[model samples]
Target: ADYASLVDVFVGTEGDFGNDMPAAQAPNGLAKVNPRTTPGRNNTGYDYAQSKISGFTHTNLDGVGGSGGGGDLLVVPTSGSYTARPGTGTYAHPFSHDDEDAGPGFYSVGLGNVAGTDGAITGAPGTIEAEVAAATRSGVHRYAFPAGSTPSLVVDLETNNTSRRSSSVQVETRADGTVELSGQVTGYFYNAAYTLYYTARTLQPATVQTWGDDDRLVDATAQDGVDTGAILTFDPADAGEIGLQVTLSPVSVEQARIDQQVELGDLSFDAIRDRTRAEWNATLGRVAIDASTATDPTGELQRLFYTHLYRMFAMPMNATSTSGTYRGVDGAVHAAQGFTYYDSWATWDDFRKFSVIAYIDPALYRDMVQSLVYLFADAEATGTGGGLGGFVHSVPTVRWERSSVVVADAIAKGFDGFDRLDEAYPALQRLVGQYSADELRRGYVAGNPGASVQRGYDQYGLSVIADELGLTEEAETLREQASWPIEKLTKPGAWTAADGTQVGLLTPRAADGSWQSADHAKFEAAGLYQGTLWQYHWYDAYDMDALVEAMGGHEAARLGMRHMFGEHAPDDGKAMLHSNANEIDLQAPYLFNYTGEPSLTQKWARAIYTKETWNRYIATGSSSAVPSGGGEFTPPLKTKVYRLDPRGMLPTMDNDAGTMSTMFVAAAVGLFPVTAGSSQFQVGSPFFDSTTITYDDGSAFTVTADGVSEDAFYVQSATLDGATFGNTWVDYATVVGGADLAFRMGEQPSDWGTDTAPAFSMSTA
Candidate 1:
């Protein structure tokens, strides 16, 4: 199937919905080229809400937040006099979505239809057709101006996203007719300072010159200063069609040119686009669906599913150069052995949803974990350890601090082919060692309960890794320390939920881990890590049995899960269940399986995944999330939490790399890593009639919900490898490596998997 055709690049590229851009990029490749409509929000530099283009940039971080990066070397194509433009020399051309188009590996739009004088264009050629395509490390642009138009491409070095504007800018036209631009910018990733270099060559060049501050054109071969760039003025007598190939590097302009020559080479613009389209299909083809018999007429769900799957690989990007060298977290270039080196990580998000990756692309996922193992090796070797809380969130992160979990989960799931465990285990242990009594006390003890819970979650992840490596003594000891939240954070009989009384949730704790006197009723109070007590209540997944016991046993645990699903609201009038958009509580729906009620799991997991009402959006990114204790959604729209619309994702929702997409995809496919370190995947109801996960090695796993539809979501019975399978969960060995899963579905829930308990839990309750 041509799954790439079903992907909607615009789904999460508008407003504050997903902080993701519709960049022209190859799967899991770097150099995401997209237009910069406007800035200020931590978006992917391409905001569909706006109708103008400042210029087309060569890169932007996919699914990141906080003034993201890669909006380097802005390239704006214009005609006529460049000085007559508006917006302070960088006059943006107004356009509309009606003329814009994008798909898996390409983006194109009409660029010239401005209304006003400075930013206005009134005349003959009417609109400039601009389109972009990207390879792994290089990008190519094709611009077609009207015949007899003075076409010019402006390359700006002083422009980037909101916060990371250029510092030391330089532009040069090398002897070989190559244009080079370099500058410094600080991005949120690793909080590291990067001197980005850009190199490019044009197909139809009229005159290549330099420009600096004040927008004055210069005839010199080069210009170096605070605000400088290179401009290529194409001759109107020529084809009026410009083909530009671009490459960027953190190391040097020499490296950038080498990359462009190797990846893009002399390929035509159309040829590059076709190559990327094939690459996208080969990657997205891992999971094939046969939902043609479904009832939906619009095919929105199909587009939505494929789009989410497409976004899953937009990051943990390949950072290796063509020369087989990559910059390490220590800010030094190092050689990669066997596997390609990767940069960027959001383990706090990527770790939870990796099972989907594991099953879909085991070889690629193995390389990713191998990248993590190398990060730690570089850390110890360079005396440059992980972030304050992370080892795999290397080269920088926002304190995910749980790199140990990814390695543990990878090893537990039987992924090998990287560096051996001798190096992996010590690196994992070093990260966990830093979260010691002294370190965590200094870091989180004085903070709110959320930070404590997050720290404890990482502790349990370390235990899983230890046990996997046969360090049973170390594993048991870590689990004991990890279980601190059960007794220390919870206060029984002190709170009552909207559904039931005698419910104990995570209470506010004092500096020394003692329960504070603040009313647990105010569960929505602002806490550390920017989450509420309710959101952070269920993170200790390894010992969820103990957690259920503390939450007042089976029925009590079920009520709490329901409350989080919006069955009832707390004193705060806003809907408490923001699980559809919030990563913290995404797994709460599956906790019903822990309550020994697989029926509730099937019902709620499907509901949360398919619900059309998610008020997770707010007043155009204006108000606070928990707004005035009222409606969390700005103007409740009749759309699912995810859809084919540009505003599909919630406003505050960030794709956060692949975290959100993987979670949604996992739920729809009926598999989730309820516990990150465990190999078992909690079996929720699958949405499609049949879906196949085909690995690169020719082995495949098929998941089927026979007769699955809107009404037939409940699983009546299931079989694994042709055996009567009653367990609420299936392990990695049985699913990806062993056999296929076929579940019988009907309109009414049956007592099929209720008696069977899940694996790796202390109690099924």
Candidate 2:
């Protein structure tokens, strides 16, 4: 029925990029979730054997930085003698992504190499599907014992939780054929406790085998100790198949009675497998755009693009199932009237660009807004607004936060312009209040040890959030506070020496406004993971006016930015020498746009994305500038640096989610992070054979680069729907509003379109 080729429709579709690989090789890239990483807030800092293993917590934030959450079912298979570890267990088997199938909302890998014998894992809610791929072992071992019910399967609720404080669970079958699995879950790490109420009906509660001292199904109910060597002694009398279907509630007893009364019908492993595939197909179909024409040479590019886009959108979606119940960061089950999502990995990559595309898709907008609500809730619960919460970006190990504000600013941008959020004003206000309140409590905003530079960044973010929520009084207060450090640290005091060397003291002293310490004077490098202060010194785009003014005014900011670029130009060998890069200063080019030299921003952006041809050996993706480096903890070496940051900054940091993808999309289109709520984009040379985006209201935006063909990706002249558009730039508002832009083609640029244009018009309005 679908005439469009799979390439036509599926070509640009992004595959889900959220799976937690267990054995990753490349740094930044993720391996499997090491169980030991859980005790230390999902840091994943310790290697497999070195780090302590809690249970493997499945759900993780896409690519931001920080804690990973949502560990559901626990499964272990072994050929050697079985030994049980209450807080510890070493179960080994060879498994990988190759042995498994991954799709939206679920992932499964085969357990052992024993032909036909494999352990398959899939999840959603409390239901975890485990199919023994090794069908010959009496067809398969399906463990469906409910909470409190005994068997060899010990489902410890406290395994992945940060603290070892235990939890309780009980299963009961009611006379009315209703089953319940009730329990009390404690998140001692956060000082929060919740009651779990689940109603799950199990089809197969394997019969207990009289093994050692462990026997008797009736006694299994009351024996509350750690289960050891327990065996199910059923004689396959009616060994048709085994499966479990479960749903949850907040009340205790009601939750216990759920799985107690389940009637095992004709459901089997094959049926669930078929259902899972169907679900993936349906979810991936939501986005109806496929750029796979035989006419297009970038088919692989489209596949990677769509696949990356798919990965980006997967996590940060509305978490509320149709049932209206959802999981909270506090590890509690709550009734949500709206939406909640996790897995948003920000940094310079995503917030700067992918968010723009999000604004364009109304559905995506709704999902992301729900995620913003989740972020606010997370900030309130954890009190850490900048780092990772539940579901962060790439795993492995790294500590770069900054993106929370990026998303917050992006949200404020939409609320300011889109109105798609309806009555979201109150929610936005609540979010700002929570973030600011948390900062104040931590003293991060008031100049504490870790708060100095982060505070400067947050101050700028607060201003954006305040402006969006229409908190005029708060906006004024925050803008002043946000600009305080910039003002004080930039011009007078120790910021500029007699020789004019720009040095930023970390923060002011409580006693004399003197330098708090020298630590804040420069950027601290994260080994090979991020950039040096020399590269990331200009991360504060929101404080541009103050930053420019502080550096002996606008001329200074411009000159500094230019000088920085000249020193670190792509041709420089530093990028080739070490992949440990903090290359966030990509925004430096756009500093010109703020300094009344819009032309420079345009020229630099075009030159960076178009003129740059990253070595394929170092990179994997098409956008040659950004390297496909370290994913989670897997770091890229100097020679491994190929893909550039979407902003075309060298020595790329971690690819947390599709942050890098966001950067490329935005830069190739010539837009920068100038404002929050507007779709205003700075123009640069287009990076496509030809591309167009359509909006919800029946409008379309087209981009065509003149004097550009297959061999030529350079810009000569441009027109929006064939008009003499002087600047060749569009704001987020115009782009999201959806226009048709076309790029004229030729082998080379007729002449460099290097003239500077006007500065971006900032508007608190």
Candidate 3:
């Protein structure tokens, strides 16, 4: 049952928009050690297509795009002579894919083409083998050198994954060949500025230590406040392998030294790697699956399965030190007595699937909630002034605040860590209250900001949180404000279906109430976020009844749903079925549950897996439409829908901080979060025959699908705890209470779960 080995760490490093870096990292670690080949906005340090070995970095944020953060503390091991300014790719050594290896908590590669004095690397053929492993706040690397060559280490402080500017750099070398490096650099998103303190020492004393400047080495003790770099050269003819342990701290260099002492204390590289592997295996064992029951053709479905599970905990890193001290946003030191501080939460992306996984674990969920609150406090204390600064996405993002929903769902489901609701309530209120005030006073967001569709959903989630917290007036006010999207929906213009039937399409409006013209065919033209009219039409998941009434009735809504499922032509020039690439339209496939036809939901949900071409569609943003519904476009790639990217880009398509991975994991096990603040889950057809989910409360939840196969992707009948289940949804109460939920599956859709649907609101009394 050691599922950790089944994880392919290299998945998501290739393909367009996969935007993930293969790194050796601990569970929710503060540091990640990854290889680098190319550099740019799309660069996460390493690309599978490139064979040059650039360097290895200590930090990376998995699954990001366009100038994403991390990629600090870059170290490249070289042989023979080295240049200071190798330009971006000049000093890069060629590497071969055949000698590369990776797994959970470990990565190794053979760096060939070590350059000689004449800059001729190919003929030299003296290779350096690099291996990296990680702990919580530290990374350890072992560099094996070829005989009869001088070994050197390059510490470049000026470069990052996103090419962020360095404000300051300081380096100190001790007589024992140890180096203390520290610097302050702006992160990928300019908003995430941080100071880093590091301590790196090799296994043996170096013969020389020098500074790199103007394309050559310079004899200097330190380099200050410039594009900085350092080089350490050991004596030639030293054939022994050298080990380097680097510790990272956001506070001070002394703290980093303490971290190094705590994590790498007299432990061998194999010992540290084995310990990290145990940690990964223990974290992954929270959910266990029977691989024998799976009918996957590639025999690597378990690889896809476990790798995604690994990514789920890759970020929202634990920012606290072992001594319980962390650098606060106020530029001060703070101690978390009983809690671990955290940062880098892409809340909007993680709310759907990652939050569900958080619900199963009490301790982690508590820290996550507290981290959201802490971010709010950080923003408040710093007086940033654009709302409470809670529930923020990373840089270059529009307004996305869904932490209230995450908090409300956790509390409603009986999570008790945030017992200090009195303190937390006002902070959440500041964020929601500010948004609602503007919407209540005017109507829509003032400027019709980018991604206007999020306003309604965010307000709806806040309303649910308000109701749960007994703020009745605030709840009622926000509930009405949440329906403000109705103003944007104008009367449908003349349109016709592909089948020659007349149709009326939903359209967005301008400030003067006129329909916004489709200047471009993309969804961005409609002033919506990542979706178009038909997609945004059903955006109001909080009150489906209102959306249904506005769209004519359940029948019209069903027709619109059919259009999205490719039963007919798309409305308003939108040429796609459901887009699994983005999160805005992901919930549309399950909207059939609200129309009293749960079977259609199952039909469309299963279609995304069986019919859709995962890599081609994701790579090109191609429509999921085929001439006929049953056409299989491509055979399975390493990265499929709900799978990992094996070549280059991202595996779960977009990697939105493990959001896509969590979505696939939930789909494979057959449950998904529907509403923002509610704890209820919508039922779907599962891929696996059986899955057992164990929580930290010593309770276990099981989902069993009997007769589950490739063809048998429909639920024939269902039971909960040996009793017949009649509802189309399951609540947090039943799931968190350790229930044995079972479903009898078959190849054909049945009228098993058409009796009931999910409720709209949470009750205070």
Among the numbered candidates, top lDDT falls to: 1
Off by over 4 Å in 1: 38-42, 80-89, 113-125, 165-190, 211-217, 223-226, 384-400, 417-447, 467-474, 497-501, 511-514, 518-526, 566-578, 614-631, 634-639, 762-765
lDDT of 1: 0.69
Per-candidate local distance difference test: 0.69, 0.38, 0.65
Per-residue alpha-carbon lDDT of candidate 1 for residues 187-220, written as tens digits (9 for 90 to 100): 3344444445567777654576666665666676
lDDT of 3 by residue, 582-651 (tens): 6766677777777777887776666564343332223222323221111112332223354344542223
lDDT-best of 1 and 3: 1
Off by over 4 Å in 3: 39-42, 83-86, 117-123, 167-177, 180-185, 207-216, 292-294, 383-400, 417-442, 445-452, 467-470, 487-506, 517-521, 568-575, 610-652, 761-765
User: How far is 685's C-alpha from truth in model 2 (Å)?
Assistant: 5.4
Q: What is the Cα-based lDDT of residue 445 in candidate 2? A: 37
Q: Which residue pairs show backbone clashes in model 1? A: 59-70, 190-396, 389-401, 390-401
Task: Give the higher-lDDT candidate: 1 or 2.
Answer: 1
Worst 10 residues of 2 by lDDT: 23-32
